[PDB]
Amino acid sequence: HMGAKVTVLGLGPMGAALAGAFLAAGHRTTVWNRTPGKGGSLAGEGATEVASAAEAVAASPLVVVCLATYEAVHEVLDPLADELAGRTVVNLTSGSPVHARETANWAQQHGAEYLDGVIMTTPSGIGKPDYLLLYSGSQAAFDGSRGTLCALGEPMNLGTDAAMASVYDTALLGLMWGTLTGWLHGVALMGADGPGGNVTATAFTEVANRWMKTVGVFMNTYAPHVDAGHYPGDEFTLHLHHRTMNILAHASELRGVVSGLPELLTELTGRAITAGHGNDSYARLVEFIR
Amino acid sequence: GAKVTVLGLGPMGAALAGAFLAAGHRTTVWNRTPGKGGSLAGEGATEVASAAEAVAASPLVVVCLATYEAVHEVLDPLADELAGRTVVNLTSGSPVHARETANWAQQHGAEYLDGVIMTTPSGIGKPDYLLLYSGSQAAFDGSRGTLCALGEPMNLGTDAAMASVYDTALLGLMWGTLTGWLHGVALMGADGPGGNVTATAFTEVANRWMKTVGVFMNTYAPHVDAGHYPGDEFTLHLHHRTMNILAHASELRGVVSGLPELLTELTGRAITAGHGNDSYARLVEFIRK
Numbered sequence: 001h002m003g004a005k006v007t008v009l010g011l012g013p014m015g016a017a018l019a020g021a022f023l024a025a026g027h028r029t030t031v032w033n034r035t036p037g038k039g040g041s042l043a044g045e046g047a048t049e050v051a052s053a054a055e056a057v058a059a060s061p062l063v064v065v066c067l068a069t070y071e072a073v074h075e076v077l078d079p080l081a082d083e084l085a086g087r088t089v090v091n092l093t094s095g096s097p098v099h100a101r102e103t104a105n106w107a108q109q110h111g112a113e114y115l116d117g118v119i120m121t122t123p124s125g126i127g128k129p130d131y132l133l134l135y136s137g138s139q140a141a142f143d144g145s146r147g148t149l150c151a152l153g154e155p156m157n158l159g160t161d162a163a164m165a166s167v168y169d170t171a172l173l174g175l176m177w178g179t180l181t182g183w184l185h186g187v188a189l190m191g192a193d194g195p196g197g198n199v200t201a202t203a204f205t206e207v208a209n210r211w212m213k214t215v216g217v218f219m220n221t222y223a224p225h226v227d228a229g230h231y232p233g234d235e236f237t238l239h240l241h242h243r244t245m246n247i248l249a250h251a252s253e254l255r256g257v258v259s260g261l262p263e264l265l266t267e268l269t270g271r272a273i274t275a276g277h278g279n280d281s282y283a284r285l286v287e288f289i290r
Numbered sequence: 291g292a293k294v295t296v297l298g299l300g301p302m303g304a305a306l307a308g309a310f311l312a313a314g315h316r317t318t319v320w321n322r323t324p325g326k327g328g329s330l331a332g333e334g335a336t337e338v339a340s341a342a343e344a345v346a347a348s349p350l351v352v353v354c355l356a357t358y359e360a361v362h363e364v365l366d367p368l369a370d371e372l373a374g375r376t377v378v379n380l381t382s383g384s385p386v387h388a389r390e391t392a393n394w395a396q397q398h399g400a401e402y403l404d405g406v407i408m409t410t411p412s413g414i415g416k417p418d419y420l421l422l423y424s425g426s427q428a429a430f431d432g433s434r435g436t437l438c439a440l441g442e443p444m445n446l447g448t449d450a451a452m453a454s455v456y457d458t459a460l461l462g463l464m465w466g467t468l469t470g471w472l473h474g475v476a477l478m479g480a481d482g483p484g485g486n487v488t489a490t491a492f493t494e495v496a497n498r499w500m501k502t503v504g505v506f507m508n509t510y511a512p513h514v515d516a517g518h519y520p521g522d523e524f525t526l527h528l529h530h531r532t533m534n535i536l537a538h539a540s541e542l543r544g545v546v547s548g549l550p551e552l553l554t555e556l557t558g559r560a561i562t563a564g565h566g567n568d569s570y571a572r573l574v575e576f577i578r579k
């Protein structure tokens with residue numbers, strides 16, 4: 001209602017965007033950066049810049065960290081172990097699951113409530129609708145800080161294991177690249193010469209956007225299959241995937257679209273049909289990649 | 291209460307007839323083999339014994355047969371009877387099949403729309419599922435209200451062969467998505483810090499994330515059409531760096547899908563060509579002729 005105290009450590013492009021969003025939401029925002037001179041614009045927006053990380057940590061019960069690497073996080077935070085007792089550390093630095101876990105354990109050993117997070121947008125998306133920030137670790141920290149963290153974007157609490165956010169980021173990027181590479185293949189197929197072709201990317205994508213709703217139905221149908229280890233094919237079996245994948249491969253070859261995607265798909269589905277699972281759903285393929 | 295005829299009562303054709311009945315249309319049906327129309331007749335369809343009678347029954351003739359060869363076996367004897375009627379052909383087939391059937395329909399004075407059904411029989415008549423049409427704009431505009439019974443109709447344009455190509459391109463998009471999804475499920479489910487997460491828990495998050503992925507597709511389509519691919523805050527350099535992270539993480543957690551290697555090789559070629567500051571859309575130049 002009236003604003004909370006929050007500190008941001010790190011004024012690179014992303015940390016500066018975080019601080020700006022906290023300020024725009026009315027929070028009393030204290031900032032620090034290792035190198036002087038990157039906080040003048042934020043000071044005019046109401047931030048208080050301080051010269052040391054120690055002063056910045058002492059300023060707020062909620063310390064948001066956004067630095068280049070976890071090596072940098074530990075260089076900044078390790079000398080402040082005693083100063084962090086009783087505070088909440090929200091670490092939005094990118095890095096590995098094991099580094100998230102090791103930082104969490106260190107914070108616990110020094111009495112800081114630790115929440116690791118990943119930012120699923122670029123600096124211009126901070127503070128805008130739909131963009132996600134994903135958090136994992138202390139549920140006390142998440143519930144107590146959610147109202148402030150909302151300033152940055154939509155928060156999602158993944159669970160209690162601090163390493164989860166790192167893994168989600170990686171898995172979600174893989175899903176994005178699969179989608180975008182299938183999208184590119186489709187754009188190229190639609191744009192090529194030939195009967196039915198010479199369609200713009202924009203026209204294709206108007207239809208593709210509608211189709212993604214159906215693709216989402218498939219993902220939500222198949223997630224319980226994976227979790228159950230039971231993959232009923234019902235009206236769309238691996239036999240049918242493999243047949244229509246070969247049609248895609250043929251159409252792509254005729255129209256000069258060479259992405260490697262049809263080959264990856266037919267090899268994978270072929271292995272599962274060879275193994276006897278042609279009547280199963282696409283979810284059965286999880287057993288052929290894990 | 292529009293009059294509509296369905297030729298073909300296989301699993302899909304029977305579902306289309308069921309959906310026309312559910313929307314209140316006066317639905318006449320025919321199938322080569324007798325005995326597949328009893329449930330539809332119970333729901334108010336008129337089953338007739340010959341394709342000629344079925345074509346004579348309605349100004350709108352919806353065809354859904356196994357192959358385009360089957361379409362011509364049924365319709366070629368009826369060429370004089372099709373003049374002035376609208377033929378909507380939802381049979382699957384090649385772009386050439388669609389174009390040749392459209393040319394034949396034109397010669398005989400039938401208005402011809404070729405389509406593709408972007409769902410299985412259980413999705414027919416339900417929200418969100420698409421049917422895509424291409425060919426006669428007069429046919430589409432005049433029949434759209436009736437065709438709404440089957441699913442959401444979209445008019446792709448005037449070239450009858452477009453629907454076939456769109457189906458192939460949209461399936462490729464579905465498979466890229468589902469394979470990235472499977473890869474992510476396997477990463478999340480693996481042993482290791484932050485792992486042992488169910489597919490259902492991962493997909494709840496992924497559903498939200500797909501809104502951002504849609505933002506990217508909409509940003510990048512105009513790049514392709516302009517031939518200009520400004521990378522802004524997420525360039526190919528950054529894609530390649532984080533793809534290498536995906537590849538390493540996947541190796542450590544035992545996930546072997548081929549996807550990370552495909553991605554790094556593709557982005558690597560664009561970076562070697564000096565496009566590291568561009569958007570993902572630049573990669574269209576590295577898969578197309």
Ligand SMILES: NC(=O)c1ccc[n+]([C@@H]2O[C@H](COP(=O)([O-])OP(=O)(O)OC[C@H]3O[C@@H](n4cnc5c(N)ncnc54)[C@H](OP(=O)(O)O)[C@@H]3O)[C@@H](O)[C@H]2O)c1
Nearest residue numbers: 010011012013014015034035067068072093094119122123
């Ligand atoms: N920008 C994005 O689009 C984006 C999106 C998602 C996640 N992220 C994550 O956000 C974090 C910050 O990204 P960024 O774009 O702002 O820039 P970045 O270049 O990754 O990090 C720059 C920040 O790190 C500080 N830093 C680096 N090494 C340090 C050290 N040894 N000790 C103290 N401070 C150190 C820099 O301080 P100096 O100014 O003194 O060098 C600066 O504040 C990264 O982990 C990134 O992966 C960024």
Ligand SMILES: NC(=O)c1ccc[n+]([C@@H]2O[C@H](COP(=O)([O-])OP(=O)(O)OC[C@H]3O[C@@H](n4cnc5c(N)ncnc54)[C@H](OP(=O)(O)O)[C@@H]3O)[C@@H](O)[C@H]2O)c1
Nearest residue numbers: 298299300301302303322323355356360381382407410411
């Ligand atoms: N089912 C789906 O999930 C689905 C999804 C998308 C698209 N489609 C497309 O919809 C069309 C129909 O699919 P379907 O699932 O109903 O099964 P289908 O096995 O492809 O076709 C069965 C229909 O074709 C008829 N037929 C086959 N050869 C014929 C011929 N020479 N002369 C006259 N009729 C002939 C069959 O008649 P009889 O009963 O006399 O044998 C039956 O009515 C196909 O092109 C399919 O690719 C289907």
Ligand SMILES: O=C1NC(=O)c2c1c1c3ccccc3[nH]c1c1[nH]c3ccccc3c21
Nearest residue numbers: 094095119120121122169173523528532535
């Ligand atoms: O460095 C980065 N700059 C970014 O923009 C970024 C970065 C990383 C990253 C760096 C090291 C290890 C794992 C990582 N994951 C990342 C990201 N995931 C996103 C999802 C949406 C929008 C932007 C990003 C994004």
Ligand SMILES: O=C1NC(=O)c2c1c1c3ccccc3[nH]c1c1[nH]c3ccccc3c21
Nearest residue numbers: 235240244247382383407408409410457461
């Ligand atoms: O035969 C098929 N049975 C199907 O279900 C199906 C079929 C074909 C097909 C056959 C020959 C040539 C091209 C083709 N494209 C197809 C499909 N695209 C879809 C999108 C969503 C749900 C189902 C489908 C689907």
Ligand SMILES: [Cl-]
Nearest residue numbers: 049050051052
């Ligand atoms: Cl200062």
Ligand SMILES: [Cl-]
Nearest residue numbers: 069070071072
């Ligand atoms: Cl590091």
Ligand SMILES: [Cl-]
Nearest residue numbers: 101104161162
């Ligand atoms: Cl932990």
Ligand SMILES: [Cl-]
Nearest residue numbers: 193194195196
């Ligand atoms: Cl042409």
Ligand SMILES: [Cl-]
Nearest residue numbers: 206209210211
């Ligand atoms: Cl949409």
Ligand SMILES: [Cl-]
Nearest residue numbers: 337338339340
């Ligand atoms: Cl009869």
Ligand SMILES: [Cl-]
Nearest residue numbers: 357358359360
């Ligand atoms: Cl054929």
Ligand SMILES: [Cl-]
Nearest residue numbers: 481482483484
């Ligand atoms: Cl573990």
Ligand SMILES: [Cl-]
Nearest residue numbers: 494497498499
């Ligand atoms: Cl959602």
